[PDB]
Ligand SMILES: CCCCCCCCCCCCCCCCCC(=O)OC[C@H](COP(=O)(O)OCCN)OC(=O)CCCCCCCCCCCCCCCCC
Ligand SMILES: CCCCCCCCCCCCCCCCCC(=O)OC[C@H](COP(=O)(O)OCCN)OC(=O)CCCCCCCCCCCCCCCCC
């Protein structure tokens with residue numbers, strides 16, 4: 001029956017996308033570090049290493065935090081359209097689903113800090129959680145500029161609305177705020193370590209530490225792909241196939257995240273919160289207001 | 299749509315039952331987050347897509363984060379487990395059961411043509427919110443400003 | 457060869473030797489020459505003089521490390537105490553923790569450290585360890601010593617450059 | 623295909639569970655947790671009622687309800703922090719001296 | 723219910739269960755295999771995040787129906803955002819959003 005092979009082909013496309021995203025996150029752990037088997041080497045090194053949960057800790061919360069740090073942004077990828085006919089879930093909510101996963105992602109840091117029976121790791125986790133809340137508070141509006149221009153929450157509709165002018169030009173402030181918010185919500189440089197406060201990844205070892213790392217790089221994949229989809233026309237290109245254009249733009253943004261890590265220095269903690277709130281939230285509110293006035297005038 | 303509704307309702311009921319009886323605060327908050335996720339799934343089963351997205355974004359993603367933050371900074375009655383022995387919850391449990399049975403007696407006997415499950419999108423909710431609901435929106439911003447002022451006045455350290 | 461107390465065993469040995477996360481513990485003037493938490497580390501590079509006051513620190517940071525654990529001693533101090541046969545110096549880090557690879561020198565070169573890394577990868581790849589803990593005995597290979605393996609090429613050396621050149 | 627009666631009964635079950643959790647606990651934190659349960663159940667009932675009629679008003683009342691829930695959770699946790707920092711004890715029965 | 727929408731529902735469900743199962747199997751293989759041998763500013767920041775997140779939800783609902791709301795809706799959102807910015811300014815000047823005094 002054509003219906004069964006159609007649904008099986010769609011399921012195979014979704015599984016292929018998921019495997020490509022996971023392997024891309026691991027391969028860019030290597031790329032942030034020729035040696036193609038080096039990733040496999042650390043993979044089975046952490047796989048075969050013994051695991052140590054602290055004795056006076058909470059087992060369920062400690063085990064649960066890396067699962068959140070992986071699956072949150074891994075599930076957030078599912079709205080991204082790669083090419084015509086290659087989407088996983090063409091949701092009506094779309095970018096709302098990305099906001100849902102980004103909201104659930106903070107529990108990984110909080111849970112790791114509490115379950116790690118250590119006051120320093122707990123303090124570091126509270127600091128990192130305050131930081132990521134301070135940037136999650138305007139992530140959604142930085143995407144609302146694009147939503148307001150497109151008039152829908154769908155991603156394919158946004159890409160089709162980018163058919164002539166990419167939203168990097170009119171939503172350049174939305175571009176900038178979503179770039180900073182995507183970097184800060186992923187807890188990477190220059191928002192990598194805000195820490196009497198030590199890291200919340202201490203007492204984590206082996207495969208849980210591997211989960212934290214691969215979840216961070218999977219989040220980088222998801223953020224760069226959504227970056228391309230929202231602000232750079234998605235798959236639209238004159239000559240190359242749409243899959244190829246999406247791949248080059250996603251790689252472009254992924255090595256630019258790597259370059260920002262390798263180049264930019266780390267601001268202070270209070271400086272990070274002050275910049276986040278005081279600059280980026282009123283800037284994004286003003287950007288959405290001006291966007292609404294522009295589209296209503298036309 | 300009925301399948302997801304019934305499993306999510308059952309998960310929400312079970313998670314709430316673990317919430318109100320548990321002793322560890324972080325565990326109780328985790329069960330509460332699970333119940334909120336289930337309630338969002340119920341909202342998605344009904345077609346209220348905006349409500350489910352808001353149940354994850356605002357309830358589980360903001361309010362429970364605040365509760366979790368407060369519990370972590372407390373570093374926390376627990377030892378005796380008063381609420382477990384039947385001589386404490388003998389009264390309130392049957393009181394809530396009587397209230398529940400009266401309420402569900404009122405529920406049974408109304409016009410019920412069923413829920414279609416047609417998705418009421420967030421765009422239509424926005425048109426309604428910024429059409430015939432101007433004063434609800436402005437005074438809800440006003441109310442949230444009031445709550446912000448109160449919570450800063452009470453909760454600051456000095 | 458002799459062992460002191462299967463394809464996937466070769467796989468885990470290959471992965472362990474091809475990705476080593478070191479924890480360089482620099483006690484003294486070997487540290488400047490050789491230039492991650494111990495819970496996330498698997499190799500301890502002990503470089504420097506092992507003082508009596510800092511020996512509990514070394515022992516504690518070795519105990520905090522998780523299995524599998526390998527130790528590389530850099531320099532004469534970590535090997536045997538070196539030139540400091542004195543009241544305040546422990547005569548070698550192998551007095552209290554087991555050492556996998558020793559490097560002579562004072563200080564050794566960084567390329568000597570890289571050669572010892574090759575030796576450590578060879579010893580890891582030539583070892584058999586308990587795969588899953590559900591025989592729980594660590595079997596380390598009694599490798600042929602480097603001085604007998606390289607004896608022929610060393611003894612065959614006849615002429616060297618005179619010390620009057622740079 | 624889903625009955626309105628079943629959704630209303632589910633909301634009632636969660637409401638009475640929140641109420642008994644509010645009553646039986648001496649710790650103020652679990653009282654606030656039960657209050658959050660009750661208000662979430664009321665918002666769920668409004669969503670069920672709005673979705674039954676095919677109206678947007680249920681989700682609008684849901685939005686107002688969760689705005690109220692956010693503000694009340696903020697204020698209640700501020701009061702709990704004040705109680706803990708002034709008494710070092712979250713027992714609500716100790717806050718009982720006004721009587722008569 | 724078209725064939726495409728149920729195909730996408732199946733694909734989304736498979737995406738969910740494969741991702742969760744991959745993470746759980748990853749941790750299961752990690753555990754099973756191997757060899758055994760605070761200040762009130764945090765509450766205030768989280769509270770501000772909650773309040774401004776609810777205001778953000780109102781702005782989310784406005785943004786998706788701009789062409790169906792007209793200039794009246796722009797005015798409505800204008801007083802909404804003005805009150806939001808007034809509250810943000812209030813928090814900034816009173817030192818509420820000041821981590822370092
Ligand atoms: C640790 C585990 C925790 C629990 C994890 C989840 C448990 C359940 C896993 C199995 C889920 C199976 C899939 C369920 C159905 C998916 C499809 C679906 O929801 O379709 C309904 C709706 C379709 O709408 P649309 O396509 O936009 O419009 C056309 C309408 N025919 O589309 C929607 O309504 C889409 C919006 C809902 C999508 C929800 C996806 C999961 C969300 C929860 C993630 C939890 C992450 C882990 C925990 C975080 C920390 C607590
Ligand atoms: C499996 C047995 C139980 C095992 C343990 C529990 C696991 C989790 C169970 C709950 C979540 C999955 C429920 C099953 C969903 C399967 C998909 C489904 O039924 O989709 C129907 C519908 C599709 O949308 P619609 O266009 O309306 O289609 C109706 C007819 N065409 O879908 C919808 O309208 C909405 C789909 C559901 C909403 C999105 C997913 C919500 C997930 C909530 C997770 C809650 C926390 C779970 C914690 C687990 C541990 C305690």
Ligand code: SF4
Pocket residue numbers: 484485486487503504505530531532533534538561562563564
């Ligand atoms: S071996 Fe020599 S160079 Fe190294 S720490 Fe000892 S004295 Fe210093």
